Structure formats: structure tokens, C-alpha cells
Amino acid sequence: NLPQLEMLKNQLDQEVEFLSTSIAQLKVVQTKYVEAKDCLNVLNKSNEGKELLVPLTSSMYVPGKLHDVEHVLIDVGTGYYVEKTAEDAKDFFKRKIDFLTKQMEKIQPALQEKHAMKQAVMEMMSQ
């Protein structure tokens, strides 16, 4: 009796935490596709042959001479890589964002809905 109303309150607290986390993270994961999208505009711009300083390993950064700006990767499938044109790569970045976008989107409709129902249980709590 008494614990049941105590139970579902902080229960619905965490779904807020979870979804806010998930949209936050699905706000995060989208951001790196345009990163993959934009870094290609730079490499087209300067030229193939510019020094690229890319990370090597932990704290290690490795240099290299830019080549093949038209040859640019889309990571898709389970374990698979499609290098794509300078045009094509920027597209599926945009795509997989938009795949993530409504994925990210409906989270807050799920996010915001879980708090007021905790409140609804918190409302009954102080009741």
C-alpha cells in the first residue's frame, strides 16, 4: 500500500534521466557526421598534398600528405566501409543524422512525458 505510491515516483524520474541522456547522446552522435561532412570541404579546399596531422594513438598524432579528396569514407553496414565521392560521403552523413534525427527527436516526447507522471506520482505522494 504505502510503498507502491513511493515506488513509481522516482521510477519515472530516471526515464527522464535516460531519455535526456539518449537525446543528448543522439544529439552527440549526429554532430560527428557533419564533422565527417565538413572535413571534406577543407581537404577539397586546401589541396591533396597538404600536411595532415591525424591522431596516431593515445596522445600520439601522426602526420601525412593529403591525397584523394574525392575518396572519402562512409562507414555503414555492420562492419563495412564504403569510401564515397566527395559528394556522396557528405550525403549519408546527412542521411544517418536524419536517421538519428527522428531517433533523437521522439526521445524528448518520451523524455518530457516521464517526468510529469513521476510528478503525477509525486502529486499523489504528498497527497
Binding site: 500500500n1 504505502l2 510503498p3 507502491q4 505510491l5 513511493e6 505522494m125 497527497q127
Partner: protein, 514 residues
């Protein structure tokens, strides 16, 4: 299934007699009781015209339809439904006789009305304006109760009747929806009929010996919770919040010992002693330990009251209603010069009595607690409305057919139209009137013919209103006798008799369908 015109009217008129006839003593002291074990399938006892109708599940439309309009008089008078059915079918008997010989169903229905008037005019003409005294009402009381029960039974009844209405005549209210408070009690005999100018309190307090005789009644009718409740209750109740339950345990008896002190102080404010009686009546449960505190203060603190009783408490005493006893002035609570807390059987039925400015007067009856005990309660209660009409009308005339002939006389003694046409209606109309005394006299005695020629010639010789000895069959001056028709009662059922008898004469088919 269908029956046309003539065949339609038969089922109508044929259905009346036997139905109608059962009532041939429903009226006056000669009236014979009738028992339903069959109405819902339950053992009962009744005499009234309209009531017996509704009581029995009554399958025939004839039986069905008047009970609707018979509801009107029983609504109005309460009796003469014990009567009206008798003239109605006898009237139905009359009109067919023409159509039997042949005549147009219209003109007979048509010829009832100036008849319905010239006779109603005779009502104006015959109506005996009487100045109502308790005695006049006593014999008004017994004429309706004779219709109901023994004149013997009418006796102990008559007292409370004319006495209850006696304090409402003070109120100058011509009708009684108060002083209609009635009580029934555990007894071997329904004989006991008791009169409390105040009320009677069904519920006893769970604590006896609080103030068992409350002399001065200071009544706060209280919805109050002096049982909030004593233990864990949260809003007053259990719930799913421990957090709230954890806070809500203590203030309970605090809110209660509040209302305890709110009565404690009140009592000693109302009283300062246990000498002057005192009363608290909760609409809900009370803590007995509250009571225990209070029962020892000189209060009778009462609980789980019925909101209805609260009113007559709030009113007949001039009582009052609060959610917090606080303190109130001693006089701030309504009063009954005595309260008598009374156990017959195992339950104390507290008489808050001579409730100050009673608008309500309580009529106790002690009885075997059977439909016997019912057959008494209904009996007085329509007489109440009957005698209430004598408050209404200053004109009360005697019953026992003293009216009928003299009324049936004129319109017959002369064609009121001097039309055969109307007299067709009228002779049909004005005839049915005689059914009541002529059967009652013969119900009790000799053939109608004698008393008829008696009562007629008598009225013809007298003009004094002479009426049957309802257990003999001989006419007696019915005014002096006391069998008495409110000019309310008789006039209405007159109308009631005819107003239905027309369009039902006018049913020239009935199809079973819908």
C-alpha cells in the same frame, strides 16, 4: 390484436365492474380490507382505491389508466380513490345503455359536462361551509379513517391527527409536509399510536448513559466528525502515502479532542451543569471516548444521524448545524422543552419533543411490526391529507351518500338542459352518483331502494344531509354523524370520474402494438 368501437368499449366497460366492485366497501367504516400476497408476490394489507391499483401489478389497461389519474386524487386527498372508481364504471354502465339501445358515443360523452357542471354547481350549492375545530376535524379525522380502519382504530389515530395539524394550523400552512413525521415501534399490538409534538431519534449513541433524560434540549445538529478517526487515518482515511500517513496519525484525535473540547466547552457553555440536558447529534460516527468524555459532561452526544432528521431537528427545535462545535451560546442550539431518550425493544429512540417552534410533529405507533403496522401508518396518513383539505376548504359536507342523491336528484329531478340530448348524457351522468351509498347500505344491509327512496325523500323532506349508517344500511343525518366529504375531496373525484370517462368512451379501437 384489435377490437373496434363497440367491441373496443366493452373491454373498457366490462373491465370496470369486477375491478370497480372489489372496492364497493373501500370507503367508510364498512370498507373491507384486501390482502396482496400477490402484488409483487408479497404478503400485505391495503384499502385504498389508487394505492391498491399500483400495489397489484395490474395487467389490464383499464386497471392501468385510471390509476394514473387516480394517482391525482390520492396525491390530493389520499382517499376518495377509495371511492371514485365506483361511480366511474357505473357511469360507464350508463352511457352504453344508450349505445346499447343505440345513440352516438359523442353526444353521451357530450351530455356529461353541463351535467358535470350543474352537478358541480350543486357542489357549490350543497357544499357546507364549516368552521374547523379540532372536534370538527376529529370527525373529519374519523370519516377518512373509518374509510381506512376501525372507527375504533380511528380513535387513537384521530388524536395525533387533529393535534399534529393543530400545530401546523398555527403555522397557517394549509398543507402538511411537516408534522407528517411518523414513527413505528416494536410492540405486540399496533394499537399504540403516539404523538410527539417534537421528533423521535432513531439512532442511539454507541455510548448509553450520556444524558438519558435531556430536559433542556440544546441541539446542534452536527455533520461534524468527532470521529475523524483515532489511529492511522491520513486525510481521515487510509492511502498509499506513508510519508503522509507518517504526518497524519496524531492530529486525528487532536482534531477530535478539539471537537471534544468544542463540545466540552460547548456543554458547559450551553449548560455549566449536567442539570440542563444537552444533545450533540453527529451525521456521522463519533469516537465513543469523545462520547466518554462528553457522556460524563451531561451531553447526549449522538452520531450517524440521518440528514432528514437533522432538518426537523434544525427546524422543529429551531436547531442549528455546524462543522465545528467551537462554543455556541446555550440558546444558539435549537430546543425541545423535554427530550426523552427512549428504548422500546433494544434501541433507544430519543424523543426530542415539544421541539421549540415545532414545524414537525412526530406520530409514533407501536405495533407487531407487520404490514399490520403498515396498514395503520398509511391509514392515518391519507386522512392527514383529507383533514388537511378541511384546512384547505372551509366547506366540508358529510359523506355516506348524503350528497349523492340530492346532487343526483336535481339534474335528474329536472333535465338540467331540458334536453333529452344532454339528459342522455345527464341521465347517464347524474345516475352513477348513487353507487356509493346504495351499495354500502346494501353492503351493510337492506336493498338500496329503501334507503334511496328514504335518503331522497328524506333530503326531499329534510334537505338536511342524511347518510347511511355504514354498517347498517339506514340513512342518518351524515353531518351530525360526522362522515364528512371535504368540498376538496368530492368535487375533485367528481371531475376525476368524468374527465377520464369521456375519451375512454372515445376509444373506438385498440391495437396491441408499439
Amino acid at each position: 390484436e384489435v377490437a373496434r368501437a363497440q367491441a373496443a368499449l366493452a373491454v373498457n366497460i366490462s373491465a370496470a365492474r369486477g375491478l370497480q366492485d372489489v372496492l364497493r366497501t373501500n370507503l367508510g367504516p364498512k370498507g373491507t380490507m384486501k390482502m396482496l400476497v400477490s402484488g409483487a408476490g408479497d404478503i400485505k394489507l391495503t384499502k385504498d382505491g389508487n394505492v391498491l391499483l399500483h400495489e397489484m401489478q395490474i395487467q389490464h389497461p383499464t386497471a392501468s389508466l385510471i390509476a394514473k389519474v387516480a394517482t391525482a386524487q390520492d396525491d390530493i386527498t389520499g382517499d376518495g380513490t377509495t371511492s371514485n372508481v365506483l361511480i366511474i364504471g357505473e357511469l360507464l354502465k350508463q352511457a352504453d345503455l344508450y349505445i346499447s339501445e343505440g345513440l352516438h358515443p359523442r353526444i353521451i360523452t357530450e351530455g356529461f359536462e353541463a351535467a358535470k357542471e350543474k352537478a358541480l354547481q350543486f357542489l357549490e350549492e350543497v357544499k357546507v361551509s364549516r368552521e374547523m375545530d379540532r372536534e370538527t376535524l376529529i370527525d373529519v379525522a374519523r370519516t377518512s379513517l373509518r374509510t381506512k380502519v376501525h372507527a375504533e382504530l380511528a380513535d387513537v389515530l384521530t388524536e395525533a391527527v387533529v393535534d399534529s395539524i393543530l400545530a401546523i394550523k398555527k403555522q397557517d400552512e394549509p398543507i402538511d409536509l411537516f408534522m407528517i413525521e411518523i414513527m413505528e415501534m416494536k410492540h405486540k399490538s399496533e394499537t399504540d399510536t403516539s404523538l410527539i409534538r417534537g421528533l423521535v431519534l432513531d439512532h442511539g449513541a454507541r455510548h448509553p448513559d450520556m444524558k438519558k433524560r435531556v430536559e433542556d434540549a440544546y441541539i446542534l445538529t452536527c455533520n461534524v466528525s468527532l470521529e475523524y478517526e483515532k489511529t492511522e487515518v491520513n486525510s481521515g482515511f487510509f492511502y498509499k502515502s506513508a510519508e503522509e500517513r507518517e504526518k497524519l496519525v496524531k492530529a486525528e484525535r487532536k482534531f477530535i479532542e478539539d471537537r471534544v473540547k468544542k463540545i466540552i466547552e460547548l456543554k458547559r457553555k450551553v449548560c455549566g451543569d449536567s442539570d440542563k440536558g444537552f444533545v450533540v447529534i453527529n451525521q456521522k460516527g463519533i469516537d465513543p471516548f469523545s462520547l466518554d468524555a462528553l457522556s460524563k459532561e451531561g451531553i447526549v452526544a449522538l452520531r450517524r444521524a440521518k440528514r432528514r432528521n437533522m432538518e426537523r431537528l434544525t427546524l422543529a427545535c429551531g436547531g442549528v448545524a455546524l462543522n465545528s462545535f467551537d462554543d455556541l451560546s446555550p440558546d444558539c442550539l435549537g430546543h425541545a422543552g423535554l427530550v426523552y431518550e427512549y428504548t422500546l425493544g433494544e434501541e433507544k429512540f430519543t424523543f426530542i419533543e415539544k421541539c421549540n417552534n415545532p414545524r414537525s410533529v412526530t406520530l409514533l405507533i407501536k405495533g407487531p411490526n407487520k404490514h399490520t403496522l403498515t396498514q395503520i401508518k398509511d391509514a392515518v396518513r391519507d386522512g392527514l391529507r383529507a383533514v388537511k383539505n378541511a384546512i384547505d376548504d372551509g366547506c366540508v359536507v358529510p359523506g355516506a351518500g348524503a350528497v349523492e342523491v340530492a346532487m343526483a336528484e336535481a339534474l335528474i329531478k329536472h333535465k338540467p338542459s331540458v334536453k333529452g340530448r344532454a339528459q342522455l348524457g345527464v341521465q347517464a351522468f347524474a345516475d352513477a352518483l348513487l353507487i356509493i351509498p346504495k351499495v354500502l347500505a346494501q353492503n351493510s344491509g337492506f336493498d338500496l331502494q329503501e334507503t334511496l327512496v328514504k335518503i331522497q325523500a328524506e333530503h326531499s323532506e329534510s334537505g338536511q344531509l342524511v347518510g347511511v349508517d355504514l354498517n347498517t344500511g339506514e340513512p342518518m343525518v351524515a353531518a351530525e354523524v360526522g362522515v364528512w366529504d371535504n368540498y376538496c375531496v368530492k368535487k375533485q373525484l367528481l371531475h376525476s370520474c368524468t374527465v377520464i370517462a369521456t375519451n375512454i368512451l372515445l376509444v373506438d379501437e385498440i391495437m396491441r402494438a408499439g
